[PDB]
Amino acid sequence: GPNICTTRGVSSCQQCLAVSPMCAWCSDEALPLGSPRCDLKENLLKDNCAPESIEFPVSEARVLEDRPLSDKGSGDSSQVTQVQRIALRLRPDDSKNFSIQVRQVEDYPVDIYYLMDLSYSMKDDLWSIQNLGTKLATQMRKLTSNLRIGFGAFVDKPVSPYMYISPPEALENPCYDMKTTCLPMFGYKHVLTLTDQVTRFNEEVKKQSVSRNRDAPEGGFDAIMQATVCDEKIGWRNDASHLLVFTTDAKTHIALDGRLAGIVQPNDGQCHVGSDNHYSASTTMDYPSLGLMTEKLSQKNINLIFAVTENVVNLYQNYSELIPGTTVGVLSMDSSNVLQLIVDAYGKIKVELEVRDLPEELSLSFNATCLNNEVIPGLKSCMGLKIGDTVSFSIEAKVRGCPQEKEKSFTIKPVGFKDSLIVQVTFDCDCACQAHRCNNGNGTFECGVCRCG
Amino acid sequence: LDVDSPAEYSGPEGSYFGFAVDFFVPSASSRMFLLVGAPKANTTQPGIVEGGQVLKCDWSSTRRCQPIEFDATGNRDYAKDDPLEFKSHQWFGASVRSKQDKILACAPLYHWRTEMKQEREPVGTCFLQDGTKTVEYAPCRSQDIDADGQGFCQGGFSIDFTKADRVLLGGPGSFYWQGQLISDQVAEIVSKYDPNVYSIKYNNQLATRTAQAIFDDSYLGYSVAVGDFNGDGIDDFVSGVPRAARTLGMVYIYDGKNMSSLYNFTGEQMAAYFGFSVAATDINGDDYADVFIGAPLFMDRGSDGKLQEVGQVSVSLQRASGDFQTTKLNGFEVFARFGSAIAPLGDLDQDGFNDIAIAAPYGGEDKKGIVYIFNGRSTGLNAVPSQILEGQWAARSMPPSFGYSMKGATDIDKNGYPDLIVGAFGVDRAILYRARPVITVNAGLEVYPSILNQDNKTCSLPGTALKVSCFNVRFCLKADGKGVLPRKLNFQVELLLDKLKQKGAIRRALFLYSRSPSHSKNMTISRGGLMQCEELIAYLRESEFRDKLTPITIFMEYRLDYRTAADTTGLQPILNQFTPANISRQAHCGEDNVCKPKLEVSVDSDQKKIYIGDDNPLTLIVKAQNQGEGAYEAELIVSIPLQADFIGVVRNNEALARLSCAFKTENQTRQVVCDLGNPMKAGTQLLAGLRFSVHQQSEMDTSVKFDLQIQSSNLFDKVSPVVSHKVDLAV
Numbered sequence A: 001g002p003n004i005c006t007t008r009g010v011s012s013c014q015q016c017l018a019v020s021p022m023c024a025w026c027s028d029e030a031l032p033l034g035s036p037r038c039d040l041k042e043n044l045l046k047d048n049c050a051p052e053s054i055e056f057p058v059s060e061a062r063v064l065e066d067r068p069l070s071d072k073g074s075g076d077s078s079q080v081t082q083v084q085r086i087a088l089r090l091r092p093d094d095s096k097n098f099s100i101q102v103r104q105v106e107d108y109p110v111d112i113y114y115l116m117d118l119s120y121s122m123k124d125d126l127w128s129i130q131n132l133g134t135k136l137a138t139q140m141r142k143l144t145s146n147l148r149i150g151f152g153a154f155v156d157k158p159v160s161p162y163m164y165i166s167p168p169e170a171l172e173n174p175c176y177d178m179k180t181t182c183l184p185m186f187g188y189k190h191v192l193t194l195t196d197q198v199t200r201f202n203e204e205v206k207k208q209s210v211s212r213n214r215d216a217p218e219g220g221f222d223a224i225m226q227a228t229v230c231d232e233k234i235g236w237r238n239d240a241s242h243l244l245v246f247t248t249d250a251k252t253h254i255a256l257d258g259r260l261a262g263i264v265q266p267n268d269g270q271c272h273v274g275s276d277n278h279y280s281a282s283t284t285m286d287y288p289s290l291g292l293m294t295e296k297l298s299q300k301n302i303n304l305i306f307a308v309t310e311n312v313v314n315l316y317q318n319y320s321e322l323i324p325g326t327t328v329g330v331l332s333m334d335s336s337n338v339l340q341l342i343v344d345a346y347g348k349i350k351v352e353l354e355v356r357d358l359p360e361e362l363s364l365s366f367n368a369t370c371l372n373n374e375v376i377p378g379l380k381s382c383m384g385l386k387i388g389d390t391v392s393f394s395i396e397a398k399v400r401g402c403p404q405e406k407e408k409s410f411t412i413k414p415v416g417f418k419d420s421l422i423v424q425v426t427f428d429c430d431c432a433c434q435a436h437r438c439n440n441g442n443g444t445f446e447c448g449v450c451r452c453g
Numbered sequence B: 001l002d003v004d005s006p007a008e009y010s011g012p013e014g015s016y017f018g019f020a021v022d023f024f025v026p027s028a029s030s031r032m033f034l035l036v037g038a039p040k041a042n043t044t045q046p047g048i049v050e051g052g053q054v055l056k057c058d059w060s061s062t063r064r065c066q067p068i069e070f071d072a073t074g075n076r077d078y079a080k081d082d083p084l085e086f087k088s089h090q091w092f093g094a095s096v097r098s099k100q101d102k103i104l105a106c107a108p109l110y111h112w113r114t115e116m117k118q119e120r121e122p123v124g125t126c127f128l129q130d131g132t133k134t135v136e137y138a139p140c141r142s143q144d145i146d147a148d149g150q151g152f153c154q155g156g157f158s159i160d161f162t163k164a165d166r167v168l169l170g171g172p173g174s175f176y177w178q179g180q181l182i183s184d185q186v187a188e189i190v191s192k193y194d195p196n197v198y199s200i201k202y203n204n205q206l207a208t209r210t211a212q213a214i215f216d217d218s219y220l221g222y223s224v225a226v227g228d229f230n231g232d233g234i235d236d237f238v239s240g241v242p243r244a245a246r247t248l249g250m251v252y253i254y255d256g257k258n259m260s261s262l263y264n265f266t267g268e269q270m271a272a273y274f275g276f277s278v279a280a281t282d283i284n285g286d287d288y289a290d291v292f293i294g295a296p297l298f299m300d301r302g303s304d305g306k307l308q309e310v311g312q313v314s315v316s317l318q319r320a321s322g323d324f325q326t327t328k329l330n331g332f333e334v335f336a337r338f339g340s341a342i343a344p345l346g347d348l349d350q351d352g353f354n355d356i357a358i359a360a361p362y363g364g365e366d367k368k369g370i371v372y373i374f375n376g377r378s379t380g381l382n383a384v385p386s387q388i389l390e391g392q393w394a395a396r397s398m399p400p401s402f403g404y405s406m407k408g409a410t411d412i413d414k415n416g417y418p419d420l421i422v423g424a425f426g427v428d429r430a431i432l433y434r435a436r437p438v439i440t441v442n443a444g445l446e447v448y449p450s451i452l453n454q455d456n457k458t459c460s461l462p463g464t465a466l467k468v469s470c471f472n473v474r475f476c477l478k479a480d481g482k483g484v485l486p487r488k489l490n491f492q493v494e495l496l497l498d499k500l501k502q503k504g505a506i507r508r509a510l511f512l513y514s515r516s517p518s519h520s521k522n523m524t525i526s527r528g529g530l531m532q533c534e535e536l537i538a539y540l541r542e543s544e545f546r547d548k549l550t551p552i553t554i555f556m557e558y559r560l561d562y563r564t565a566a567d568t569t570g571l572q573p574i575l576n577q578f579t580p581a582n583i584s585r586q587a588h589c590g591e592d593n594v595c596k597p598k599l600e601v602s603v604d605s606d607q608k609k610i611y612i613g614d615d616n617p618l619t620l621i622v623k624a625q626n627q628g629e630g631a632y633e634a635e636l637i638v639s640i641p642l643q644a645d646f647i648g649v650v651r652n653n654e655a656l657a658r659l660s661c662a663f664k665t666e667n668q669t670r671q672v673v674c675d676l677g678n679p680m681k682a683g684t685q686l687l688a689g690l691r692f693s694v695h696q697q698s699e700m701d702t703s704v705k706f707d708l709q710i711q712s713s714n715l716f717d718k719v720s721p722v723v724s725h726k727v728d729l730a731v
């Protein structure tokens, strides 16, 4: 019966193709006069039109590059493959669907920052600090590959109370009273920026020595807070999972402890490390409170870890409860107990697509298959993925009208994945037959209408 | 507490003017003074910079502030070209406590060259000044040198005065920061003062000894409090130990005679700094002093289940048996440090129970500092603050810290009400808040005719011969108040005869003279038991209103004329914070004095069919009656369709009552208002016939609907059930 092809007054093959995907045009001159040249192709075959003279382009999604999905990013053979070329052929106002695959193959970037106490109380433990620093990078390089590592150091606030100011010479050598050499004491210094080089980190770690203060608690919370609140100096990476290991053996000074030293101004919570890689506000700012420390740790997603000796393990265990998400480990000659924390922190640890250079006349529909073969149409993101987790997205492309440009291309890519699909789009709007009707030469037959002369 | 126009004092920039405040009450003279410590001011001592100061602010007379010449001499010499002490950058003014003529300031960051070896050690020096003789007191400057002894005592961090003139002093840093408490009599301190000796000893001294190595760095002496806690009449020693018990915090109670341990309070959250500030004052008026311990870094579970730092104050009530009853106050803002300064005020309102102020110097808007005031209630504390004081100056280069230090319990204005001074060292300012006299006023409103009869029409309306029914209303005012006050208060008395009736729909009661539901009058009351009273006569509208259901409500309010009630200084009084400013009473046929009609109506039609295309005369028979009591303003409403026209009441029939019916069109509703009877007596039955003209020509309607209801103005069952009559159309 009559349909959209036979009712819209179609007068040419081009108009027949543009009206609807279901419409087909018969170019056969043997078709009896009065029969609809534009109709369903089944009607045309029933109308005994020549199948060769029936122009019915069919949209196709042919695969151009389908190199297999990789398993490990460390394989030297062939490039790593996470997502490669597709070709789409589309007639006007018609839609076609294809499927894509994205898998997390590359190892997760990891940032590890080391905090060390250079106070006299750990001359017996400096070897353990350096050994732990070595084994940190040693263990992390054997699991991930985008590692960035670095360290800073802290002693205490350099003011009279904690600083040996009594003899004019003991400033440069706080161990004067026992006739020993040591470095002048400092609030906080950022020594080594985060960098992939393990040798530089080991050499700078092994060239660190102690200083001397007065009271057993040490201002390590200033060190933690300045490490967290500073981004460019420390060199944190927006994509890596941030860790900040903290080492000590004695108690810790807390907020409002600095009122003794004449310091009452609250911890402003801003990066104050100047151009000399030193805490420039260690003499006018109080120690930070646990609330502010937790707020900033959550703000910059840093997983603080406590590596302390046996004599303060319980104190720091109880301190961890007020700072959620932080664990504690025993600092000794056997650092496996605290390396297990780093192992689990890495094991604790997003696919979202972005469209580039998409043609305006094209429209895309997203169907997301993230986990358990579950399809959520209209979404483009999948959460909670691990190593080996492969997700799939079903994408349907719909063209609006017929663009004047026969060939265009666009690329679909996950965010931060490099690997992508380059789609080649070809629009089939013109019929092959288009390559006397107007009363035998009385006009020009264009677009299906005869412009009479 | 007056907040509109307090007193402001400012010192040199960056001097921390306001880090410590107190009141100075010279017994010799009558004027009272304000003591403000500026622990970073630039003195005139030779070769001393940022030596610290303590200032005397004169309050009333031009608000001039001057520093006190505690020490005009610079460093002293142990030998030639060898200084003995380092007075520069010492914190002179970090603590100020006064008691009558005695002023006690301290410098917790004073360094002196140890007599044995050339060395720099902060021991702390305190300058106790009597009427004219100024002496120097420094218990920690002893032969127990070095951090192993009293070398890092930092004595003078926290100081207090005892009722028997026994200075209490706390050194956080003694004994490797184990902390120490030192107490000495003032007379012995003044007698033993020898300038040329640097290790003066005192015979009657009480001190805390060195404990084991476990109690190190406990910060004992951070804060000090004195009160009686053993019943011997001698103030004990209460000190804050913020770092004790694995940083949980502690407050130590020591005997006031031989320094023995009586009671210890342990914390619940580490690093909360349990013991940052303490106070000792009985709050519930039972004469047993109670403790007030802050923890400005307490983290409690939030709305979403996470920890938020708000600050907590612990209140423990003292019992005869010895035990303490503990209640806790949490903060209201995050990072506000609620519990940093706890300042007793005594009887701020003279309610009979002492009142205290707790401050959060880093809360409020812009973190400008806020102050909470609480009042004393028996068996605890009024956990809901009654007033809010807020900082006024934004940070220049330092958090303003408004409320970091306050001092109360002293009546600077001399009007029977204690005042309060708040320090703003962040912006180096000091603020004095004068309390306001609490006047409690009791109002008595009585209406003699609780239920009155409209038919009691024995009252004459002035200006007309008409009669009305009027009632008597009695209203009285009395004013009682302590402190300095004027003898007469010019009260403003306002009252309204009708409450509810929203949007001013209608009011039924008007006063006898100058008819109105409202009346205003200025009356003068004398403080005391003289319950001054006045009376008024008011009368209701007969058929001027359709609402008798809701009771007539009599309302009274009283606003004090504050402007003329202020003293010579302009401090206006205040009314009681808990008193109700408005008192409302309800006023109101059978014994219940409520006429309750029972209205029912039935409808019958002479013609069961109406022909379309011509005028069909429809006669309606309506049978109306009341089974209940008298129905005032009772009327019949007949909602007729647009095609029905009312012609008149059937009068050719003697059995049908010739009603007075008026056809009214009100808001697209065509109704016939039939006057059934004003009182609608009980048991009366009314039968009437109404004729209508029907011009129905519509081809869609099947019948014509008529809605007839009995309405009245009565209290109960004032409207009959709606009855709908349908007359079927005919062809």
Ligand SMILES: N=C(N)NCCC[C@@H]1NC(=O)[C@H](CCCCN)NC(=O)[C@@H](Cc2ccccc2)NC(=O)[C@@H](CC(=O)O)NC(=O)CNC1=O
Binding pocket: A119, A120, A121, A122, A212, A213, A214, A215, A216, A217, A250, B176, B213, B216
């Ligand atoms: N009376 C007490 N001992 N009270 C407990 C205080 C203990 C506290 N320490 C000690 O007694 C022991 C005495 C040596 C015997 C080994 N333990 N001294 C130390 O532990 C030193 C270094 C050291 C370690 C081991 C052996 C030798 C030396 N560590 C410190 O942190 C220093 C100085 C510093 O770096 O700030 N002291 C303080 O901080 C507080 N001051 C102290 O005295």
